[PDB]
Design a protein around this ligand. Structure first.
Ligand SMILES: [Fe+2]
Ligand SMILES: [Fe+2]
Lengths: 666, 664
């Protein structure tokens, strides 16, 4: 059977393989650049070939697929980050090829933004893009075989499960929908210990516990009152600050009216979205199961002014005639407290507390500390291509996406970047960051977690805490060794020319007054440790599981699609139809779009580990004191790997069925 | 045991894990940017902060490790390609974010180089770097537990095998104990990195060899050649003509060692030959070598020629293949020949540089909208920026270095350097139409269409490409017709005439067709894809496997050719090992590093994904639906052909190494 035939019998015959059975996983960048040109999603230019400032196409795309558009955003956003990298190379903000530059020059390159943009103090950069990403998202899409179709929970649950691959990176493949009881008190609350935002829960202030005891009396629950009065390890996740941050009064309601645009000027058609300044009360039991006791939907100064609901179950083992799955008021209350934990996570805990706090310290360090010095050499490796990425996020993620799907507004789009709430929240979260308080060891004390001395194993279900305590120590231990090699006494630090003006540059221009004025060896070691902790394990801790928790929207949605129930009465009268009405499920209210973005957001952000750092730092110092450095590395390398085992134990050590925390694994 | 203890019991206790047991596989880019700065391998700048044109450090690195330096080159070269990409973005040669630009503008951006650089016609770009890569390569390295230490074949063979853990990717030809064997040497001309240049032997040569065979006194070999049943040839004799060297000269490269800039006076010498090989393809399909002319100087009267003791795959001799040191040497020489021809002509010119020209022509001539531009430009993603980093480094910094052409390394005069003269010659004697697969196979003398004898069973490149070429042409056919239904349309098409012209003139590819027919367009467009993907892949995918075990395919000799035939036959293992880059002396450690490094540099994007992608954009409300079909058939045709490829891999005679190269 010669090649002559072999070719013909393949051309002649009907297709043996159906292209539709094989789903498109990643783009031919060349094909996709043709399509962005074909569709006029490109920069327009004059005769002389200089930029207009407008795009080629006047209007966006008409029809598309969820599947297809999800991919098209992933890609356009990658291309945008490539652009950002190539730019910061040209502007020399982050040069690709190395270049020696004297401090005196780097002050003229690394210059602060002025707040014009509506963001905190970040590197200056020498809306128009946000247009292009809208143009990618069609007017309307084919709703058949999408993950939001429903129109009921069971329907989207069935779809969600179907998308998982056949027989930590395996975890990556799926989401929380894998668990049938994702909605459960147990799994809802464990998200506050081992989720994407496990660092903001704290012990409940007497002042609040009083408020709730007082509210519990009024609703008539002697059981709940007794528990709170006893007050055995009552915890809190308090989003009440949202109002204070946005400057909204107790009589206002968080809302975002989404104006639909035909190219530039709106159609007059609008969608509305609602977020609440929720509050949650938990109890941590002797066995270590964290359990929710109360949710204030939206907190407006007091619980007299607020809609508050208490759990029917007062214990992990407590049983009620109504099953968790059918308790629609509670399930709603929990869905609200997830829209709260979405904003706090995505805005404060990720974007500010790791990315923007960082960018400031980087600018300070680049302006103040010369490329030679020890500090610069142990820090700058952890800041590889951070500035260029942070930019693509300023010019897109917040305005184009976080501002869109979130229930803050007051309007989408908003020309006024100031006066927009999201930005006011970014601004507030930035100012009320506390550099020294988010040193792990302090963090755990302030919030009320005896991780040091507890042998009771009530913290068995809090692996973030147990992992970070351990890991923080190992990083501090590495930092300690290295810093001493030059800073043997508090004098050396005090006479060091750069450290004084460095601590200053940050506290002033960086607007991080909580950053220490370092004099001691201890103070330097902590600050340097924090910077790495922030640049790696923390970013990782609050970014690695982002898809898993957020991609199944009904488990953690970004904002509500129905105004809050007007009072408690209403709330208790809620049914499945009320809960589904609040979610972005079905065709109406342009809910298809929110689902796409809300689920897309992780993939945008999920786009460089410690072991490789150590290995690399060792393999250069094999030739301050470079040998002491080398040791630091080869111990650090070991300490991590040995701690890596201890991490996987805390993951197993959680009570029956409690999902893994595999996040800080080498 | 609380976390308090768990931390203590890790700090307190002796380290459970020794960092030295875990070798460094990949760099923290941040650490490595600090080290390149620390070591002054960086661009220097004045008070005013503009570039000098010199680097910070005056001198290079003192000591390093083969392992460590191999990695440090891999990385610095990656950083260099990133730089090139970011630059072509700034200069808008290849913009990262899309931008509509009118043809009239693209003529002002996409402009031809002038030959100053010593290279053929390529995009203009708005030594200094080659300095930085030298600075990475130390003065001398620790020779202990390196793959060149030896000091004998068995020694480096034992090391080579030890390093083995996409599975194929893990290892190299050393996996086979009889890598040196007639069988495996010759199969490299059918299923190696250069399987497209072997051809049927001209009567004029077969006469020459019959004549030489008579003189040496081998009635056996004479009878075989006179009978002349499927005699093939791999003829490198053109090297002299290309470099313009006379039959009285010897190819040599005197490598001057530098202390930063000005040389130390210390030199190494390297020698290449314009070899010729004669094979016979047997009924069963085993290709078998019969003769090697070490270096061909006008005739075999002037040249050292050697005939194989074995006149057949099954033929046996009292001396084993493994101990036949003259033959093994002769074969090692004919590999230095196939190294130059491969790395220079078959890869760098025939795929990368021919391409760059057509890209420039297409960008200058055809507007971004047009059908041609849309089906072509996807196959040229980030090609121009990469091609640049190669001009500014691979040739001068590496190919020119390890190759035995010179005449000097480094050479200020880019012209007058032989490598460049060979690039130049290979470029001019390319034939766009003749390297259409179907023609290629006919000219060279391969009835792949009609042969049912299965003598071509051991030539999977041929059988795979014939099949694949057809499937690509079939896809191209469908798409082109959707706009070009008749030869008229093509003839009146404004751009095609001036496009074919732009190439034949400015691109210096006169062999590129003046297209009038539908057939002519379809072939040209097919060739461009064939060249941009399966061909580049065919002659680049196995580069590590064949080249990384240097004694199997070394880039140049480290001993002058034996003076005459007498000498050659008097060769022993010690002569063969003397020619290779093994041991400490003659700075042979360095050649091994680069020669083995070269693949990994070029190793830095398949058809299925193309099809899938082209389908998933043309699924919406020329004709886009006909396009979409073309895609969803092409998608299938590939996958179905993908099976047929793996059959030809199995279909090779016992033990003949796989050809897995065109696998989706
Ligand atoms: Fe991030
Ligand atoms: Fe290549």
């Amino acid at each position: 059977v010669p090649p002559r035939s072999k070719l013909d019998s393949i051309l002649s015959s009907g297709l043996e393989h159906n292209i539709d059975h094989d789903p498109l996983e990643v783009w031919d960048k060349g094909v996709f650049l043709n399509e962005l040109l074909k569709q006029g999603i490109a920069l327009s230019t004059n005769e002389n070939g200089t930029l207009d400032g407008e795009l080629v196409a006047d209007e966006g795309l008409k029809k598309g697929s969820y599947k297809g558009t999800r991919l098209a955003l992933t890609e356009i956003y990658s291309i945008l980050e490539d652009a950002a990298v190539s730019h910061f190379d040209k502007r020399g903000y982050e040069p690709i090829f190395p270049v020696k530059r004297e401090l005196d020059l780097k002050k003229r390159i690394y210059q602060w933004s002025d707040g014009t943009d509506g963001y905190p103090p970040h590197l200056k950069v020498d809306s128009k893009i946000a247009q292009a990403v809208s143009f990618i998202i069609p007017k309307d899409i084919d709703h058949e075989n999408t993950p939001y179709k429903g129109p009921t929970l069971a329907d989207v649950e069935k779809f969600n499960k179907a998308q998982f691959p056949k027989t930590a990176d395996i975890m990556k493949g799926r989401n929380i929908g894998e668990y049938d009881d994702w909605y459960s008190d147990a799994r809802f609350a464990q998200q506050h210990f081992s989720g994407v935002n496990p660092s903001t829960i704290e012990t409940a202030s007497q002042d609040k516990i009083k408020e709730y005891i007082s509210e519990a009396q009024k609703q008539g629950l002697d059981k709940v009152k007794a528990i709170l009065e006893d007050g055995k390890d009552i915890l809190i996740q308090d989003y009440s600050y949202f109002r204070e941050a946005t400057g909204a009064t107790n009589e206002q309601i968080f809302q975002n009216t989404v104006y639909e645009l035909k190219g530039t000027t709106p159609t007059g058609k609008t969608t509305s979205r609602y977020a609440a300044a929720s509050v949650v009360i938990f109890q941590l039991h002797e066995d270590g199961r964290l359990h929710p006791l109360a949710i204030t939907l939206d907190y407006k100064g007091s619980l007299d002014n607020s809609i508050t609901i208490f759990n029917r179950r007062l214990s992990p083992d407590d049983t009620c005639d109504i099953a968790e799955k059918e308790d629609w008021p509670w399930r709603y209350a929990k869905t609200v407290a997830q829209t709260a934990d979405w904003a706090r996570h995505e805005v404060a805990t990720h974007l500010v507390d790791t990315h923007m706090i960082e960018e400031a310290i980087i600018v300070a360090t680049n302006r103040i500390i010369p490329e030679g010095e020890l500090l610069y050499e142990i820090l700058s490796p952890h800041w590889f291509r951070t500035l260029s990425l942070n930019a693509a996020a300023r010019k897109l993620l917040v305005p184009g996406v976080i501002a869109r799907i979130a229930g803050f507004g007051p309007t989408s789009p908003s020309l006024d970047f100031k006066g927009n709430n999201a930005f006011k929240l970014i601004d507030w979260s930035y100012k009320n960051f506390n550099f020294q308080d988010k040193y792990i060891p302090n963090d755990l004390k302030k919030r009320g977690f005896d991780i040091k001395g507890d042998k009771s194993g009530k913290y068995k279900n809090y692996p973030y805490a147990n992992d970070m305590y351990l890991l923080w120590g190992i990083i501090r231990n590495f930092v300690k060794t290295v810093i001493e090699s030059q800073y043997t006494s508090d004098h050396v630090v005090q006479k060091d020319p750069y450290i004084g003006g460095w601590c200053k540059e940050i506290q002033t221009n960086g607007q991080i007054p909580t950053f220490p004025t370092i004099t001691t060896v201890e103070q330097l070691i902590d600050a340097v440790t924090m910077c790495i902790h922030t640049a790696s394990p923390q970013h990782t801790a609050v970014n690695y599981l982002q898809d898993y928790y957020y991609s199944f929207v009904p488990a953690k949605p970004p904002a509500l699609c129905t105004p809050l129930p007007q009072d408690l009465s209403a709330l208790q009268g809620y049914t499945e139809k009320d809960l589904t009405a609040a979610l972005p499920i079905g065709t109406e209210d342009m809910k298809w779009k929110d689902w796409l973005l809300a689920a897309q957001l992780p993939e945008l952000l999920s786009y460089y580990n410690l072991i490789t750092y150590a290995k690399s730092l060792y393999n250069v110092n094999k030739n301050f004191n470079c040998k002491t450095i080398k040791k630091a590395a080869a111990d650090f390398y070991s300490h991590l790997k040995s701690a890596g085992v201890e991490f996987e134990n805390y993951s197993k050590g959680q009570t029956a069925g409690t999902v893994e925390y595999p996040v800080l694994q080498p």
